[PDB]
Amino acid sequence: CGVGFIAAIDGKPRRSVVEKGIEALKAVWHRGAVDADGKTGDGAGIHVAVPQKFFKDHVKVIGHRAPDNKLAVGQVFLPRI
Amino acid sequence: CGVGFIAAIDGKPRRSVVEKGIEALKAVWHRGAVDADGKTGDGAGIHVAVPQKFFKDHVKVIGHRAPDNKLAVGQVFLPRISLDAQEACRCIVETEILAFGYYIYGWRQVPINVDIIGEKANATRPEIEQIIVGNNKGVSDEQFELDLYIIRRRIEKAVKGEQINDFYICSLSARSIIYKGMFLAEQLTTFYPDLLDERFESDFAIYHQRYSTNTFPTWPLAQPFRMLAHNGEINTVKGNVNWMKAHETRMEHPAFGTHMQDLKPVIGVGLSDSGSLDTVFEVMVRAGRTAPMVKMMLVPQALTSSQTTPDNHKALIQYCNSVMEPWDGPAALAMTDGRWVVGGMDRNGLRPMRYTITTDGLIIGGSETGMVKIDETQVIEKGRLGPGEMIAVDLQSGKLYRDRELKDHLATLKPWDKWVQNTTHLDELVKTASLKDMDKAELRRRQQAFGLTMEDMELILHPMVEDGKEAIGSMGDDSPIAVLSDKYRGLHHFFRQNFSQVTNPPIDSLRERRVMSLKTRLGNLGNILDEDETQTRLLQLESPVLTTAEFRAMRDYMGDTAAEIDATFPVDGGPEALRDALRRIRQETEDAVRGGATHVILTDEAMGPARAAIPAILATGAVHTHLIRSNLRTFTSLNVRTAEGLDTHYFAVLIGVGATTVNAYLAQEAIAERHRRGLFGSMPLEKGMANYKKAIDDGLLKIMSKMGISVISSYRGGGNFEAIGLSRALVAEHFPAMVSRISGIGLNGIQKKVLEQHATAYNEEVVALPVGGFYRFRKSGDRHGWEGGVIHTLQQAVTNDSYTTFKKYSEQVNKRPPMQLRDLLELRSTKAPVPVDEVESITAIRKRFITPGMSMGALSPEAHGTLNVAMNRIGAKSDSGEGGEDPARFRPDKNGDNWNSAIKQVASGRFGVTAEYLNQCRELEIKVAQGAKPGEGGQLPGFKVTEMIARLRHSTPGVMLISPPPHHDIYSIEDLAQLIYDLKQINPDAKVTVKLVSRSGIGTIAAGVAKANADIILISGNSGGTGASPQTSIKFAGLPWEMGLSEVHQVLTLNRLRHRVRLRTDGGLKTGRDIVIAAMLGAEEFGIGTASLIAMGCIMVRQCHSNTCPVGVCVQDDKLRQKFVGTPEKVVNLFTFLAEEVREILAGLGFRSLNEVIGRTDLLHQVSRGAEHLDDLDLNPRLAQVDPGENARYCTLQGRNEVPDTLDARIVADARPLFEEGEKMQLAYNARNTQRAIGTRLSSMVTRKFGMFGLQPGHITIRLRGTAGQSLGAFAVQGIKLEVMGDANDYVGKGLSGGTIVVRPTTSSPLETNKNTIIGNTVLYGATAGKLFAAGQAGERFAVRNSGATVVVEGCGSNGCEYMTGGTAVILGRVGDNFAAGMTGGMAYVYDLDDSLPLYINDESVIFQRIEVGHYESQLKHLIEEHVTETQSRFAAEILNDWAREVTKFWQVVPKEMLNRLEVPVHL
Ligand SMILES: Cc1cc2nc3c(=O)[nH]c(=O)nc-3n(C[C@H](O)[C@H](O)[C@H](O)COP(=O)(O)O)c2cc1C
Ligand code: F3S
C-alpha cells in the first residue's frame, strides 16, 4: 500500500528515473499484507512515458519505414479462455 | 449424451413417472464423456410438473394460508462470489413481479450437497433459489402464463441493463419446473434431495444428458431449456438468426399488446443454437398455436413430388415452407407445452429415437431402447420415429396420436387447398411471354475487362454445355493464395467454402436428391404470428439462377414496381471512388425502398471506356447489410446481373451474401457466340442451355450439401464462408458475420487492381484473350510451386545421391518469391552455434517421417509396393490408403522386404475393411476428410477398376465407384467415440489416429477428439493431392495447414490436453526448412506426401483421372505399367537427404534435438514486402503462445490410452479350453445396454488363432437375455454365433465377416412379430460375408454398403439397401422411401401385399420384376426355410405354408448391371 513518483526538474528523459522507480517498488513489501503462499498479491502498477526509440526499432524490424513524428501505443486486456 | 421422455396417457399424475425418470437418468453414463477425476460431468437435466402440495405445505408451515388456485414457482441462479449483487437481483425481480398485482409469498433456499461436485464446476457454481408467487387476481390460467412470460422477458432485459453477470431464470411458470446442473447423470438424485419426497408427482418427465466439446462448464448452458430438449447440433444457425432479425421488424399479434414492443430482441446473445431455437419456439407457441403446428413450421418434412403424402398434407407443407424458413440439421426433438407432449425428428432423421407403449397407459421414449426396466409381459407395441414423423400425447383430453393420425388431425383446421391455390410458378408465365445481339469486338473487350482467359475458360465452360458435368481435376493445387498473387484476381478467389467434419455429417447428393429442394420465393415475407390466406400470394421459382429471356419475363411481369441501380464508378475519380460509390448506392437503395419499390435490381450494363464496374460481391454485401441494419429487408428482394459469373463457386458466393436471384447475361451471350461458329456439332442452343442450367444447379446443390444443408432458403444470406486476405474492418462493416483471422487488402488494393485491369483492357485494341495460367502451368504468369527445372534437378539429385545437387535443388525451391504464409516467416535464434555432430543422430529423425496413404485404385500396385518396401526398410511408418490391401502382402518375402503396411485406413466406404485386415497393422486411421476435397471422398472413374480392384473390394467390374461422403456411423461426436471404442477393441495393440482438415473452428473438434480417446491428430492442409476430383472443390476449399495446426495446438494446450496426444501435419512439404517450421509450430510427426511421387516417376502430367499416365504410376493397363522406372533406393536416399538437411538447419540454430524446439514461438518473426504496399498481414494471431504450465509442451505418455472393459473379457476367461484345444462351446449371459461391442475381442482372438475361415459355422455360441448395446457383434469372424432374446440397439452386425447373428423376441412377449422395431439404424454397415436373421422391423439405412452378406428382415425403413454392392437381402413387409438408391450389385426380394412398391423404390439403376425362373424361387424358398428354422417365427411359417399362393406377391429387385453378367439368365 502506497504511491510514489519521481520527476526530473529540468525535463530531460533518462534511464535513472525508471531505474529509481523500479528500485522504489522493490522496497514496499512490508506495508502490504503478507501471504503464506508466497505468490499472491494485491496488484501493483507503474506509469511512465512511451520510449519512442524502442517502438520505432520494432516497426523498422517489421519492415515499415519509421515515421518522423510521434507514435502511439495502446495496451489492451482481452479474454484468454 | 441422450434425451428421453416418459408420459402418462390417461392424464393422472403419479410418482412412478419421476421414479422411472430417475431410473433412466441413472443409466446414461456409458454414452457421455468419462473423466479421470470421477466427479466432473458434462451436464444433466430433468423437467417435471409442479408439486402443488409440497409448496402449499411450505407456505402453510411458514405461516400464511394456502390458496385454492394454482401456485407458481420460479427457479433462479444468482451470483455467488458477491453478496450485494444478490440484493440487486432480488430487488429487480421483486419490483418487476409486483408491478402487475401478484402477491409474493416468499423465497426458499434449495438444499443441496456440494460434495459431489468436481473441481472445475465448483469454481463457477452459482446460488440456486426459488420464489413462490400466488394468483390472487382470480384470473384464468392462460393470462397467468402469458403474464409470467412477459415478466420473465422484462426481468431479463432489466438485469441486462445493469450488466450484472451470471443471473439466469431457469423456469418461471405454474405448470412445470426444471432441475438442471453440471453434475453427472448418476448423482442427480443425490445433488437435489428434494426429488426424493413422495409428494413430487407429475404426469410427464423429460430428461437430457449433454456432451461437452471442451472442459470448462457453464451452468446456464445446461439442458433442458424452458420448452425444448435438443439432441445434436444445427447447421444453419447463422442464416436463421439473420432471418429472425429480419422478421423482428414486422411481427405483431393482439395477444400480447403494449408489452409486444418490449419483446423485440427475441434472440439474445451468448446462447448456443438450441437456446435460440427454444426461445423462438416459445415465442411462436405463446401467440396461440399448438405444439405440433409450430413443430411442423420450424422443421418441416421433405416435400417430395411422390404419391405417398395426400394432397391436404401437401398443401399444409407448402404453407409451412412459405411462412418461415426451416432449421436444418440433426435434431431429435422432444418438446412440451402445458397441454401437449410432442416427440419428433428432423428432415433426414440422423439421430435416432425409439418409444414403447405399456399396458399401464404409459409411454416411454428416448435414444436407446433398454433404458428403463420393463417386464416383457406388459409391452403392447414398439416402434420408432423415421424422417419427419412425430408422436403426440394430449394431456387435457388424454389421448395418443401417432404420425398419420396427428397429421390428419392437423390437416383439418383451415382450408389449406384454398390458400396455396393463390400462388403462381414462373414457368407458364415465361412460356406465354418469350413466344412474343452483341458483336465480337465488345464481347472480347468486356471479357478482357474481367480478365477471363481463353483456353482455361474453354477448359471448364465447354464440358458444361457438352455433357452437363463440371470439370474433373487430377492433382492438388499449388497456386499461391489470392493476396500473395500479383495479377488480377476477382473477389471470388478470396472466399473459401465451409464444411462439417465430425459434429454433423455431410449429405449425399447423387443418392438423396429427393429431400433437397431449390425453390425460391418472391413475396412471402411478412408477419409470422398471423394466420390468413393473404400471406401466401407470391412468386415461386424453381431455381435462383436466371437466364436472359426469363429475367426479361420476370421484369416485364413486375413492370413498374421495381427499381434499377447502376453498379459502376467513374475511373477519372480520385483515390476514393469506390468509397463514395458505395455510399451513393447505399443511400439510393435506401431511398428507393422507402419510396415503395418492393424489388431492387443490381446491374452493371453501364460499363464503358470511362466507367469501371464494381465487383458484385462487395456491392450486394453492402446493400444487404444496409437494408438489414435499417429494418427494410423484409420489404423487398435483391436481384443481381453479373458480367463475370462463370463457375458454380461464383453463384454460390453471390447467393450466400444475400441476393435472391442471380442473373448472368454475358455467359449466355458468349455461349451463343461460340455456338454460331459451329463448335458443338449438331446440338441446338436449347439443349446446350438446358445442359448448362442443369450443371449449374447440380454444382450449387453439391456446394450446399458440402456442409449439410437441404434447403436453399435457409442458406441465403447465411454467409458460410471465410475471407482469407481481407481487412477485418471491411469484412466487418460491408459483410455479414464472417471471420478473417489475418488481415488483408482493403478498399485501396481492390481499387488499384481493378483500375489497372480496366486500363489494360480499354486503352489497347485487344485481339484475343491471354492463354491463362491458373489451372495448368504457362509462361505468361502466375508462377507455381512445381516447375520443370525443379523436378529435373530433384530427380537427378535422388538418382545420383549427390548432396550438393540436392542442396542446389532446395536453394532453387526456397528462392522463388513468397507464395505461401511460411515464406513470410524468418526464423532467428539467439544463442551460439553448435557443431553439427552434436545434434541427434540421423536415424532418430528418419524414424519420424511417414508417407501418407494413397488409394490403390489411384496408383499402380508397383509404386505402392515400392513405397511400402522403402518405408519398411528405412525404419519409418508407411500408410495403406482407402483401397485396403492385397492379402498376398501379409507375409515377409524371401529377400527380407515386408510388403505390408504399417497403418491401415478406415475410409467412408469400408471398401477393404475385414477382420483379417484390421489386425495385420500397427496404428489404425480414421479419415474424416482429405485435404483436396473436404466433403466428397475419393472418386474413381468407371474404367480404372480392373478385375484386381473388383476382387479387392468385391465390387462389380467396370462400374463407377464413388464413396458416400458422410460416415454413415458418425452423425455426432458420440458416434465417433463409439467407433473409436470398437476400433480399440478389435485391435488390442494398435492406436487410433483421426485425420482432420484445417479450417476455422477446428479447435472445438480438436478438444472433442482429444476427449474421445484418440491418440494422434492428423491436420491436413489445402494443397494435398488427389486421384480424381472436381476442379471447384480443389480450387476454393480448405485453408493452409499452418493456421489450423497452430489453432489446434493452442486450443489443445489451453484445455490441458496437449500432453496426451501427438500432432502431425502434412500438405505441401518440399524442403527441410518447412519441416523445422512445422516442428516449431507444434507438430511432432511429418508426412512428406507427394514429393516421393515425383522422385518415383511422376512428372506432373495431371492425367491420373484418365488411366493414361505416361510414366505409368496411375494406370491400370498392362502397357503403361511396364514403363515404371521407380526404384526403392531412391526414396531411401531422398529421406536421408531430408534428414541431413534438417540436421544442418538444427545445428545452425544452436539446438540439439527436435524435442527441444516443439511448441516454441520465440524463434520466428514476420517479414513482409513494404514496397508491395498490401495491408500488412498481421500474423500475430498465429505466433501467439499459450503458457505451458507444468506439463511439457511436447510431452506424451508412453503406450496408448486406456479404455474400459466390456463383457468380452469375462467370456474369454471362461472359454479358456477353446484357445488350447479348439472345442465347441456354448455360453449364456444377461445383456444390458451399458455393454458395448460384444464379441469383438473374442473375434480378434479367434482371428489371431485360426484366421477367418478356419472354424466350421457355429463353433462357439453365445446366448444373451435382455437388450444388447451399440454395435452388437461387430466384426464377427466365421465361427461365432450370437443369439439374443429381447431387442438390439443399433449398428448391429457392423463389419460382419463370416459370423452369424440372430435376434428373436422372447417367447413370453405377446407382441406380433412383424409390427415392432427390433434393431436400430445403419444395420450391417460394410459387411463382407456371413448371415443375419432377425424377427422384426429395422431402422433407417438398413443394410447400407453391403457386399456379400445374407440378411433376412421382417420390414425395413427409409433408404434401405443404399449403395449395396453384393449379397442377398430378403425383406418381408412394407418398405420405406427411396428404397434401393444407388444400388450397384447383388439381388433383393420384397414381399409386397398391395402393389405399393413402385411408388417407393428408386428406379435409377435398378429394376423391379416378378420371379419366373425356378432357380431363384428355390433359393428364396431355402432362405426363408432356414430363417423360420432359426428364429421360430410364426409369420414366416404362415408365409411358407401358403407358398404356392404367396410366391406371386414377391417382387425381385435387380440392378441394371447384372443383366448380362449373371450366370443364371434372369430373363426368359
Ligand atoms: C494421387 C493421390 C492419391 C491420394 N489418395 C488418398 C487417399 O486415398 N486417401 C487419403 O486419405 N489421402 C489421399 N491422398 C492425400 C495424401 O494422403 C496426403 O494427405 C496429401 O497428399 C499430402 O499433401 P501433399 O499433396 O503436399 O503431399 C492422395 C494424394 C494423392 C496425390
Ligand atoms: S501428374 Fe499424375 S498421371 Fe502420373 S505422371 Fe504424375 S502422377
GROMACS .gro file of C-alpha atoms in nm, chain A residues 61-64 80-81, chain B residues 216 828 1054 1166 1176 1187:
model
   12
   61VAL     CA    1   1.243  -0.462  -3.790
   62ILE     CA    2   0.889  -0.550  -3.900
   63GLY     CA    3   0.965  -0.378  -4.231
   64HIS     CA    4   0.796  -0.039  -4.232
   80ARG     CA    5  -0.800  -1.561  -2.293
   81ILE     CA    6  -1.012  -1.872  -2.234
  297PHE     CA    7  -1.498  -2.557  -1.899
  909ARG     CA    8   1.616  -1.638  -3.578
 1135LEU     CA    9  -0.543  -2.443  -2.327
 1247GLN     CA   10   0.725  -1.184  -3.955
 1257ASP     CA   11   0.041  -0.596  -4.369
 1268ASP     CA   12   0.153  -2.052  -2.115
   0.00000   0.00000   0.00000
